[PDB]
Design a protein around this ligand. Sequence first.
Ligand SMILES: Nc1ncnc2c1ncn2[C@@H]1O[C@H](COP(=O)(O)OP(=O)(O)OP(=O)(O)O)[C@@H](O)[C@H]1O
Ligand SMILES: [Mg+2]
Lengths: 50, 250, 100, 50, 101
Amino acid sequence: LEKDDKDAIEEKFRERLKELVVPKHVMDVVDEELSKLGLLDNHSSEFNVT
Amino acid sequence: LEKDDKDAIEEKFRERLKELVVPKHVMDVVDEELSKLGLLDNHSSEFNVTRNYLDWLTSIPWGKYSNENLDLARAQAVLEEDHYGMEDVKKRILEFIAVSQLRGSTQGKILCFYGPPGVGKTSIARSIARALNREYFRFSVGGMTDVAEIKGHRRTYVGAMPGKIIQCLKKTKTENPLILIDEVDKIGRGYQGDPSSALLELLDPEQNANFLDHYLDVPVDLSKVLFICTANVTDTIPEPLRDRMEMINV
Amino acid sequence: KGHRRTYVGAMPGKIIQCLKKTKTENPLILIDEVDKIGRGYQGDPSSALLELLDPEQNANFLDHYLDVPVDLSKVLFICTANVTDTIPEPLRDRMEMINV
Amino acid sequence: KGHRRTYVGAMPGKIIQCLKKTKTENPLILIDEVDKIGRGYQGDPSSALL
Amino acid sequence: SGYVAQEKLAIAERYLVPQARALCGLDESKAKLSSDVLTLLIKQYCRESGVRNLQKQVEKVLRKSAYKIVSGEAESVEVTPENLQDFVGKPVFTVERMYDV
Ligand SMILES: Nc1ncnc2c1ncn2[C@@H]1O[C@H](COP(=O)(O)OP(=O)(O)OP(=O)(O)O)[C@@H](O)[C@H]1O
Ligand SMILES: [Mg+2]
């Protein structure tokens, strides 16, 4: 599986956060962007930008 | 075997919109948009733009008001506790809190401090927000050369977002935050729609109540907001913009 | 300061590229030759620089691309200009001088 | 001037919104601050105004 | 364009003052503003082609009266020219000297 789609992409992002101690502010922002990415289609100009 | 996602979103938007006192200008638009959202197939590429549109239109508070403290006696102490001198500015804020206690409903103004650098123009704004108790923001306009920040984009462009003022007004749930424009006089001439023009629509003491940023196209009132500015020297500012605002002088 | 992110090629301003390229949050950024920044044909870059260099206020730097504020108070800026007159007054106030 | 109607999400120019909302063909449109138009890249709105 | 001082006095007496008074909520009895005071304000401090600046001036005096009543002492501020200096601060435009003979 050389090209990812939805599951693994979010997964690798959410795990990459771990060692960092993010200020509590931005977790909300990252959460809306993640859920919005989850509902978005794999092919559209919106998806690659987000 | 099947669920009802369309009904899920069509109700959850409705539920978030329940408690707000939504103006009639909006309710019809949000309703027709909500129906248009209800028709189309879920994956259709247009459908996302509408699920986003509603996600902004139902989010921005419509009359939710961060109640502001009224009695001035207690306000004195917190105002003086971490600054000194500058008596004229503190006298203005005391006048303001007093009149707000007298007429009932909360109401805003526009102000513009100016003076030699390092006098304290920028550290007081946070203290004022702690005194009146309305929620704070900050908005540097140093050197900007793109009107989109004050006016957003038209929503057929991919990834359009409303101008920075609406993002403020959403980030703080209240409707009347203390915006703090900063360094107004160093705003640049951007060789195409220099931003200093756009600000004129925003700061009219009376017309302000119908701001019309492009993205969410319904006009939004802003009269309650309490703008403040700062300016190292008061010559660069274009004349009408110099005229809109009071000029306290630290 | 980057661009608005709804354009085509938007990328965050130079400093955030610096702050990603070196994993630490406190690099020793070395702005250089401050005296000879451009001026007077578009908006002054100097008018943006103040937002970085204010000793306290920088703690809520706000790059346009990623709008969420980026704390960077721990950074250790340095600057090196050979004549200390041309720098505009509001900017000259922020940064202490040391004469070699 | 709106958009071409073939793009996703296209909507008519602002003046037609004014007609559809005022619901009459003789409104008192009030353009404001005519002189501040930017007339730069890829646009030239002043042309459309003429 | 333009505004003669007479027009500015008429407008200030029938449009601005009642409107700013309702905006600040003061009862009309509680803060008299003699038309002579408005003449003094139009002549010395606010003297320019626009009307906005006069609005800010009259709004200023009403605000100071408000803070004086709600918490201070006087039950009726009474603007008079003699006292006006402390309400609107230092006048800008000096009156021309008047010779008598
Ligand atoms: N009256 C005061 N008491 C205590 N500190 C003050 C006072 N005035 C200014 N300061 C100090 O100034 C610092 C920030 O001042 P401020 O940012 O307002 O400068 P400034 O006048 O805004 O400069 P510029 O307007 O050029 O940005 C704070 O650290 C604050 O302690
Ligand atoms: Mg400052």
